[PDB]
């Protein structure tokens, strides 16, 4: 079996969440951060036919780029990963499972406490203005009807008061307020439109972003206001 450039691109984006990854047989890939604060899942076209744990995914994808696109991938007799080309062959090592952190099961996202959607333009603008104005922490909030996402600077402001950026997405219908603060360190998604689900309970919370290829789940900080 092979790996299309979009599959390798999804894996390369996943590599920003974890340097390693766990692959089980099927057509479904996933990964978790070591601190469990972010998570990613994806339904992909190419088929996985043998379970393997990968220690360094970035170098693996680079070596895949070093050979042809029709590179056959299989499991060598010693247990490693064989990559067969026309005349060349690569033997990438297989990792021990105890040295890579993987989600033990696909996470069951509960009922969405709130929902919205984000166009790709808003996401790219948010990323650019964060890189610019040095935004390290964001927060979703409700104003006079619409749901907006604001961003301060947690280093220069431990109390979260100076709104250095804000962006408007859609309208909110309900009766409960929710100002969820989230750290930017758990924000590794490829650009595009995302259907945003948000769940909260008690001091805990999560935010799922459904995309065409992958879904990205992000945790909330400790002192996040719920009002649910």
């Amino acid at each position: 079996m092979k790996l299309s450039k979009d599959t390798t691109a999804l894996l390369k984006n996943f590599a920003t969440i974890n340097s390693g990854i766990m692959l089980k047989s099927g057509q479904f890939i996933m990964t978790r951060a070591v601190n469990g604060t972010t998570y990613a899942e994806a339904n992909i076209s190419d088929v996985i036919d043998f379970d393997v744990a990968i220690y360094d995914l970035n170098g693996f994808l680079g070596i895949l780029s070093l050979v042809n696109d029709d590179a056959e991938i299989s499991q060598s007799e010693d247990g490693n990963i064989k990559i067969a080309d026309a005349r060349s062959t690569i033997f990438w090592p297989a990792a021990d499972p105890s040295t890579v952190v993987a989600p033990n099961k696909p996470i069951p996202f509960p009922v969405a406490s709130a929902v919205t959607e984000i166009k790709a333009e808003d996401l790219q603008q948010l990323l650019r203005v964060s890189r610019g104005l040095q935004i390290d922490t964001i927060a979703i909030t409700v104003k006079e009807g619409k749901i907006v996402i604001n961003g301060f600077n947690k280093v220069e402001d431990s109390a979260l008061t100076r709104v250095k950026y804000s962006l408007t997405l859609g309208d909110y219908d309900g009766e409960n307020t929710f100002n969820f603060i989230i750290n930017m360190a758990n924000m590794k998604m490829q650009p595009g439109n995302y259907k945003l689900l948000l769940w909260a309970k008690g001091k805990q919370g999560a935010a799922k972003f459904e995309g065409e290829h992958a879904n990205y789940v992000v945790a909330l900080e400790a002192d996040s206001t719920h009002d649910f």
Partner: protein, 186 residues
């Protein structure tokens, strides 16, 4: 931690498995305990006439001589090794000090001068400004104190206290306080 299960790893595992090398650097600096020494096992042999071979131990003529110089009973031997023993072997130095220093349980605390960091700074400033030696600077400080011109001179010199100069004054990071002490010097 979205996954509310997990036996949870220690900080070292989280740092290494994530390959975040700054966390790895902090975890390694966690083990930055420093300053190990066993020189006083040698001195004891010199003092208590214990058997001790320095053929495999690290030796320091300065540390051994300064440790033995704290008690007058050993000052003859330290004096002799300070005069004619500089060109001797470490083994020969140790052998002589064992043969000469009289037996005795004398271990104690070294005699160290406690200094006025502010007065040291003032003397160093006066020596830097007027390009004089240390005792000339102390004499200048005496004259300026008994004249009342010292606040005026310290005011004129307050700009000379750069952050590298405070390193020469005192290694204690509380040097910052003297910095403010010199900022408010009027």
């Amino acid at each position: 931690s979205l996954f509310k299960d997990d036996i949870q790893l220690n900080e070292h595992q989280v740092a290494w498995y994530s390959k975040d090398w700054t966390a790895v650097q902090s975890a390694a600096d966690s083990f930055k305990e420093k300053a190990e020494n066993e020189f006083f096992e040698i001195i004891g042999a010199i003092n208590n006439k214990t058997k001790c071979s320095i053929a495999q131990k690290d030796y320091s003529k300065f540390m051994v001589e300064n440790a033995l110089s704290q008690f007058p009973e050993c000052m003859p031997a330290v004096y002799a090794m300070n005069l004619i023993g500089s060109g001797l072997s470490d083994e020969a130095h140790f052998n002589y000090l064992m043969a000469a220093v009289p037996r005795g349980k004398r271990y104690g605390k070294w005699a160290k001068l406690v200094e006025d960091s502010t007065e040291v700074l003032i003397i160093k400033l006066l020596a830097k400004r007027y390009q004089v030696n240390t005792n000339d600077a102390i004499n200048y400080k005496s004259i300026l104190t008994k004249n009342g011109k010292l606040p005026l001179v310290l005011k004129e010199l307050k700009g000379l206290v750069t952050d590298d100069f405070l390193k020469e004054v005192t290694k204690n990071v509380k040097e910052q306080k003297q910095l403010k002490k010199l900022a408010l010097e009027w």
